[PDB]
Amino acid sequence: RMTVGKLIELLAGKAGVLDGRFHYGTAFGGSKVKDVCEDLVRHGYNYLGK
Amino acid sequence: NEEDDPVVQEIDVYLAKSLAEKLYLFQYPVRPASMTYDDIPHLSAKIKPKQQKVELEMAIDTLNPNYCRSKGEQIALNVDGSTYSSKLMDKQTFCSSQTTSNTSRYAAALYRQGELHLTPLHGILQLRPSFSYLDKADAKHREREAARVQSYEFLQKKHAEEPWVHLHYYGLRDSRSEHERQYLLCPGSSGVENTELVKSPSEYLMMLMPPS
Amino acid sequence: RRPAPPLTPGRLPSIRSRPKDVSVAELLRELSLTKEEELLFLQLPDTLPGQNACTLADLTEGQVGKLLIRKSGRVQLLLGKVTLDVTMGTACSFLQELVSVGLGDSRTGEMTVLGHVKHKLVCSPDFESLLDHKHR
Amino acid sequence: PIPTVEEKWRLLPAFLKVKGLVKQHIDSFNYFINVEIKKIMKANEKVTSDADPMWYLKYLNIYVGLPDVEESFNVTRPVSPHECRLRDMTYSAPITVDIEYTRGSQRIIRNALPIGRMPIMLRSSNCVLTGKTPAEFAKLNECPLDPGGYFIVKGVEKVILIQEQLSKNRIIVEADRKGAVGASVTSSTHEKKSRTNMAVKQGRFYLRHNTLSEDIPIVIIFKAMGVESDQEIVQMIGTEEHVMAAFGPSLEECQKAQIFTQMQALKYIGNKVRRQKTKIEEARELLASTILTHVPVKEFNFRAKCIYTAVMVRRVILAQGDNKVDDRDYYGNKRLELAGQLLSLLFEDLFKKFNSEMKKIADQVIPKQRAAQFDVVKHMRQDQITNGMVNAISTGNWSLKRFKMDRQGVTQVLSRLSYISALGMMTRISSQFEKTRKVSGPRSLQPSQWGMLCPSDTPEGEACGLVKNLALMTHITTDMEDGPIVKLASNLGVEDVNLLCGEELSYPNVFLVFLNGNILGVIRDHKKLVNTFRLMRRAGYINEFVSISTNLTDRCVYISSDGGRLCRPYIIVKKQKPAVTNKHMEELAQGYRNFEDFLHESLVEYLDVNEENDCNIALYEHTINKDTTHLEIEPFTLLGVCAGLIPYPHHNQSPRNTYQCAMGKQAMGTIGYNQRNRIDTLMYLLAYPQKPMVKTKTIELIEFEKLPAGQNA
Amino acid sequence: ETLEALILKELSVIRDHAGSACLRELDKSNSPLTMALCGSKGSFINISQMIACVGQQAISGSRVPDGFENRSLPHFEKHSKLPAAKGFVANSFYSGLTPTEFFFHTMAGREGLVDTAVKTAETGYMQRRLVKSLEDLCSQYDLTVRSST
Amino acid sequence: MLLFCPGCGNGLIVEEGQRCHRFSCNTCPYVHNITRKVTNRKYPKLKEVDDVLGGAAAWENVDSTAESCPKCEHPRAYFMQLQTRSADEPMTTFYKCCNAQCGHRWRD
Amino acid sequence: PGTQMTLKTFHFAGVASMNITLGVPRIKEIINASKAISTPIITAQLDKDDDADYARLVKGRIEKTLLGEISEYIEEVFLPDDCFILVKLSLERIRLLRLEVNAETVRYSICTSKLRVKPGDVAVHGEAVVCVTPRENSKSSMYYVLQFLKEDLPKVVVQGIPEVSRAVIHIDEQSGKEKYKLLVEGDNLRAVMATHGVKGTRTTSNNTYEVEKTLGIEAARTTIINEIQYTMVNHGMSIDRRHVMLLS
RNA sequence: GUGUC
DNA sequence: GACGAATTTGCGTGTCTCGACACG
DNA sequence: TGACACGCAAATTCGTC
Ligand SMILES: [Zn+2]
Ligand SMILES: [Zn+2]
Hints:
The structure is cut from a larger assembly and holds 2 copies of chain A, 1 copy of chain B (about 210 residues), 1 copy of chain C (about 140 residues), 2 copies of chain E and 1 copy of chain F (about 110 residues).
Chain A: H1 5-19, E1 23-24, H2 39-43
Chain B: E1 8-15, E2 24-32, E3 42-48, E4 53-59, H1 69-80, E5 91-99, E6 107-111, E7 115-120, E8 123-129, H2 133-146, H3 152-161, E9 165-170, H4 175-185, H5 201-208
Parallel strand pairs in B: 1-7, 2-8
Antiparallel strand pairs in B: 3-4, 3-9, 4-5, 5-8, 6-7
Helix pairs in contact in B: 1-2
Chain C: H1 24-33, E1 38-43, E2 62-70, E3 75-78, E4 83-88, E5 94-103, E6 108-124, H2 127-135
One zinc ion binds near residues 69, 71, 72, 98 and 100 of chain F.
Chain D binds 3 DNA and RNA strands through loops.
Family (chain A): Belongs to the RNA polymerase beta chain family.
Protein name (chain A): DNA-directed RNA polymerase III subunit RPC2
Subcellular location (chain A): Nucleus; Cytoplasm, Cytosol
């Protein structure tokens, strides 16, 4: 199926429910995977998905 | 933008209503600009100013080194079976059509030594050679051998309501032509007058485009 | 052999046996340096500025125009305050002549040929300067 | 680094607040019941009988009221949409007219004369559901988030789908099974739909129209129009070496047949013409106002028509010998059709029927009378109008043989499965082609459409492109007049076509002016023309919805002002830079300087598909070059309503995007704020709807966070 | 025509080299790479398209055709015969496609979605036309095939 | 070519006269004498000799790869990439070509 | 296989841009067995397989060559005497193309052509300059006939097979082997095979009706088995020989 | 007519 | 020189143009 | 809106009185 937006959406949703704010996922922009993964470290979880 | 100050040429413009009322521009789209029509002798000229309808007939040579009399006498018998007062065809018929009845913008311009004269045009006309003398010929030959809505015939009768005017021709060299050239050239007001019309662009643009 | 079969594509030469456009400024310059006298057919904008419309018929007689020739520019007509630009269009290739028709009492009339026209110019007001003045 | 303004994302909400998504469906109807309804009344204005010219009636003014219901006996009380939805009633308001009729000898002017009813939209101007407050919206038992735009007939919600059709009053030149052929379709306001076509075979042009028996040579048509001499014919066609080798044969076969006068050509045509009054007048009036009626003739002058046919023949000649062909896949030519003009045609046909048959109701009574005076308001009826309107809306059979048309499947019941299925159906567009396997071009995604129709939004199945949806940012232009436009074009210095002959149009410098498929004249140096017209449009004098384009391959400028064009705002830039700055948008954030004055300050402008053909648009502000003319506001507005719910659409593949935008309308959830009161046939609801964590800005634009149809897990 | 294919082989080389250098950069426990080695659901093409680059989106076995006049989109230049302009996409699915790249990618997705809708009709027609002629041909007991006659 | 008459405005056809051939027409009396020489030069577009198609020079255009072929034990290999939908879900197919003394074509 | 056979010409490359129908349309054409086919492809082998300029010489033999394709310039004279048309045949343009066309060949070609002209008013003045005199008879004047004679002289062929349209030579190589194969795009197999250059025994066609009427009915059952198998191997499908042999 | 395979 | 006979070719018209399920 | 197999029919050539 070649669907990469699913994993990105899962990551953003996890980071949002951990932090407590909705993350923007609009087309041709939104949020990247560089500032969100480094925010998932402050809490104590793994950085990408594991 | 200031590079336009040094080189500034001045040209005066005049307008006259002396020949504006009596002025008609003739157009000849069938003829190349190289050749001329004022050299060929003209036998008659006909006008109706009520509908701006001009009918001209030109006189050509009957027996010149370029003429086939065999075809000529045949066409003469065809039209004979009166239009022509000779044995062959020696006349050509040109018919007109009224174009741009609302002729106010178009004006003729003459450039003398240093002054320009603009005369308003009454009407612009197009002269075209018609071929209807064969229509009547063929129709008469067939006659001999055989035997509220607004339509076109109403306007044909409307055209038939008016009488017709006959005109004389004056061409290349005539004292009358130079007289008319002077009458359209002579401005009368040779002195430089001021305060004829003042309209700032803020008023002209508002007059051009109505807000309503 | 004056009467020769003319050509539609080469109506300008019509040689058959033995196009260049010019600016109005240059054109009037060479027309003036030869000191000749020829007629010109000019088109004016509708509803001229005046005192409802205003054409040349509802106007006066005398000097009401001023032409200006700018360096590296165009030819610019003035009536004191209004500004117009004039330029040549649809260079005619056929015959165009103007005559004077004269009507007498009932039928007797005189028709005299004045001259021919071989150049058509068109003049119109540039709305750029009008909008620039109105905006400022 | 380049100065970048990260503020232009607030222009889009302010623009959708004015018009956009569904507000145009109401704009087409609010303009129709205020402009066209009286134009039709003025069209059919005087009607009289022929028994004796003494009886006649006159139409002074016509207007409609507010939604009212007629109960048992003179009971007219204001009804709400929910009451009509529960009682299986129909939402309609009466049309009261003020006409005058002469009975006996004196004239009677009866004011407020009812003639019938007419349905009213839910969020129109005459309805009660406008300018209210949510507290008052809850008083009438209606969801405030309901976009509206449908019709309530017999307790069902019916919406009319937008239908696309081809452009009229234009010349097409396409190739068929043997060679190339030019065609012209003509249809003005008056009912006259004609389709003429010129074809090439054996190096001979032939004109085909269904009124003629067989082919008529083009030179014969020319000689019949009025141009007699064969030299000026070729002059009007074209003065070139290669165009004469292809036009000589036709000239010589024309010389073969003995036709040299206008009467000969007219008799030839009249003999060719069959119709089920002489032959000459038949052929004359047939060439006058039958073939091309979009080119009006003042007295009897066929000159504009013959120059039009000549430029058509020139376009066909230049198409001949090359591989330059016109396609129907271009959307700059395709026009859209809303529910306004359909209702206009229906209403004018019903009005003409009602005027023409009632003319016969009092035509069998005048000789066979009993008294001196005849009353007509008692010889009056108010059921045919209501019956016809309700039948056309509910049934869906648009059958107008007065207009020579039959259309089926135009109105459909509004989908009330979810909140997205209801709004997404309002932007659904239907095509004119039927659902067949032959089509591959129109179904294929065209490069022409950019930001007007969602590419991903399309149902997968049989119809794979015949059904399309509109984009977020686009506008449908309504119709205008052309008086001031033609006046300003004439003042700019455009030339009259009736003065110059056929030779000057072959000149490369000469450019022709086209306005809604009409030749205005010849213009030189078209760049100044385009620049001045654009400046005047940016000024504010001319309306903003007037397109202008130029084509150099045929050297013609087109001026389009017909209604039904696609328009989306673009930011203007001046030589390196966007005119919109930070200080201009800070005021917008403050509460002033909205969209209309932004358009009045010459900062943004609308462009069409054909006008953006000759323009350079920059995606971002870092890609702005020296030839870019306009700047696209945002690139994420290209996605549609159903495609705005997919997180990271660029990350996903287009088949998955299509599957998801198709499944988004089938997903079950909450419907609205009043789901307990409304009683629909089938309703699917959820128990505890959650809120999407990874939301989109399009979700906030539609306020999908108030009615979600899913859950987080 | 020669220029169309001379640069078409220059773009596929970049994608192939990137995909080949990506294989030496991946681990031995990569789930997509593991599925590709197994061959259950996936291939190396999908891996190279998701990691390195998508490649070039071909339409009708050729480049994107012009759509306004001598240019596909109005954002590019007139008579612009450039790879990245016409039909070459550079960003991968992980990085993020641009609007012009997303449009060129969804153009090819509609090429296959309209093709799978039309095949069924004439395929079923040719099937029901082919069965109606061969449905009684049987083998006898003497090793001979005959018809009803 | 295209020749018209100046008097009437119609076209002319050449036919024999009494002593010599004549430029005649069927609308107005007008005949021009045919003299020493009248002719025009035309240049029809002449045909080109076309190219020889096929060969290894044409295969030099497309890029090859390095992959063995289990028919003649050669790393010589040309690769082709095509799109096609299978029965379940689309998957990119690839064609294999051997650049050797046999030169066969397979589709995996 | 046919349901999974719905993409167009697969072998996409600049090497040979030959519009060949292969897929469900070609299978449908085979099943329908139509007389008039699309994409005519005829393969022929040469006797001299290494000599290439010889293959060029035979390539010019089987190919429709027009007269306007050879004619460098044509003229219509006008003089006090009776006029005529004069065509100047170019010799060098035949030389680098290596045709068997002389002035007498063109004269005899026009003398047996469909246009109304017989050897009464056609002569050869010099080396490669031909003259034709328009006569005055049987429909109308000679001027109107002159306009009909100037439009069909290029249409009149000078050599080749008229319905044969285009031919190309293919180079097939090996370790040290080289062959030149003639690809003719036409239908008249009996005419392209009955020549000197191409080897008449080894030459195959694509139209079933042409091989049926030229070779026979038993030889047409073999070309339809290879035609179907050639359409299935480029798709990656697998059918057995017996299924095709039973249908054939 | 709409929806799915 | 003039009339009956048989050939090749442009043009007229009819038939469909996969399956299944559910709801109003 | 593609497919060509049937008739229906007019231009044209070899032939013999
Ligand atoms: Zn003549
Ligand atoms: Zn091998």
